[PDB]
Amino acid sequence: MEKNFVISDPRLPDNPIIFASDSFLELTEYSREEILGRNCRFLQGPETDQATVQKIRDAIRDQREITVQLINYTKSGKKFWNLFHLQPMRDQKGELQYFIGVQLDGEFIPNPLLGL
Ligand SMILES: Cc1cc2nc3c(=O)[nH]c(=O)nc-3n(C[C@H](O)[C@H](O)[C@H](O)COP(=O)(O)O)c2cc1C
């Protein structure tokens, strides 16, 4: 199965990506070398809804799962709608270890309804 996903380590400064799937490299047009150690916000740009970024920030703060749809940009500046699902990952002792982020490319929710 095709899986667009990244794993971040929230126990390192600014939640860096420590793993990016082949499909994530393909979608975003970045090499693994350009992604590893970055915060995933580098995919955002002018058209990204700051209200949606806020919802993600709060979900990471409270270590809660969330799904949002937001505008991201490939290396070559191509806009794509990203249906982004965030999942906290806890160790055996219930301590946060990682976040996993799974991307789906597509305008799943029409922009006119998303904007409401
Ligand atoms: C595992 C994981 C995957 C993420 N994937 C994306 C993504 O694909 N696109 C995106 O815009 N933001 C993504 N983010 C969110 C940003 O890295 C950042 O948390 C968000 O923009 C809110 O924080 P900020 O306001 O400090 O940027 C992801 C976050 C995590 C933890």
Swiss-Prot record:
Self-association and partners: Homodimer. Interacts with PKS1, PKS2, RPT3 and PHOT1. Associates with CBC1 and CBC2. Binds to BHP.
Subcellular location: Cell membrane
Domain notes: The activation loop within the kinase domain is the target of phosphorylation. The PAS (PER-ARNT-SIM) domains are required for the binding of FMN chromophores.
Biotechnology: applications noted: The flavoproteins improved LOV (iLOVs) are fluorescent flavoproteins engineered from PHOT2 by improving its photostability and brighteness, and which maybe used as oxygen-independent fluorescent reporters with a small size. The iLOVs are PHOT2 fragments (385-496) and contain many amino-acid substitutions relative to cv. Columbia, to confer different properties in term of stablity, brightness and color.
Expressed in which tissues: Expressed in leaves, stems and flowers, and to a lower extent in roots. Present in guard cells (at protein level).
Similarity comment: Belongs to the protein kinase superfamily. AGC Ser/Thr protein kinase family.
Note: Undergoes a photocycle characterized by fluorescence and absorption changes induced by blue light. Half-time of photoproduct formation is 11 seconds and 15 seconds for dark regeneration.
Mutant lacking the gene: phenotype: Plants lacking both PHOT1 and PHOT2 have curled downward leaves missing color changes and lower petiole angles in response to weak or strong blue light (BL). Impaired proton H(+) pumping associated with altered increased ATP hydrolysis and absence of binding between 14-3-3 protein and H(+)-ATPase (e.g. AHA1 and AHA2) in response to BL in guard cells of plants missing PHOT1 and PHOT2.
Positions spanned in the full protein: 388 to 491 of 915
Residues of the PAC domain: 64-105
Residues modified as S-4a-FMN cysteine: C40
Function summary: Protein kinase that acts as a blue light photoreceptor in a signal-transduction pathway for photo-induced movements. Triggers the phosphorylation of AHA1 and AHA2 C-terminal penultimate Thr in guard cells to activate them and induce stomatal opening in response to blue light (BL). Also phosphorylates BLUS1, a kinase involved in stomatal opening. Mediates calcium spiking of extra- and intracellular origins in response to blue light. Involved in hypocotyl phototropism.
Modifications made to the protein after synthesis: Autophosphorylated in response to blue light irradiation. 2 molecules of FMN bind covalently to cysteines after exposure to blue light and are reversed in the dark.
Sequence positions that bind FMN 2: N39, R41, Q44, R57, N72, N82, F84, Q103
Sequence ranges assigned to domain PAS in this UniProt record: 2-63
Expression induction or repression: Light fluence rate-dependent induction, independent of light quality.
The protein's name: Phototropin-2
